[PDB]
Amino acid sequence: MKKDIHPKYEEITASCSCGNVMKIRSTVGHDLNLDVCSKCHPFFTGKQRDVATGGRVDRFNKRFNI
């Protein structure tokens, strides 16, 4: 790479609230703080909870119950 023209591509430690510590290299500065990662994100459960939302007949039966 052309030295001088690029910004400082330094190593840093990512550490989310979940507990997954993870060293990477990027143009940020000193340290990082994250919310979610590839692990801990609700997509494997998300699709299970999102798809199974509908249901009108049981909602009627829960009110009447007879």
Binding site: R56, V57, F60, N61, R63
Partner: protein, 79 residues
């Protein structure tokens, strides 16, 4: 929405549906009761709700349950 003491259907529509369902699918039922709710047993029937001047056929689906019959019969025509 109102009514927690049982969802409301007219005596005549309940007996007409119970008689229609046990026998089998046939034809659109003339009913004027728009006020009446839709039970789970009404699914499959193409009941004809009174819009005001004529009867509008309504094929009852899985979603059409908690909603009343008059919701599927526009009264006032526009454009």
């Amino acid at each position: 929405r109102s009514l927690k003491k049982g969802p409301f259907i007219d005596l005549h529509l309940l007996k007409k549906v119970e008689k229609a369902v046990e026998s089998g699918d046939k034809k659109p039922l003339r009913t004027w009761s728009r006020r009446s709710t839709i039970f789970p047993n009404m699914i499959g029937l193409t009941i004809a709700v009174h819009n005001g001047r004529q009867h509008v056929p309504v094929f009852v689906t899985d979603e059409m349950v908690g909603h009343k019959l008059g919701e599927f019969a526009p009264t006032r025509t526009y454009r």
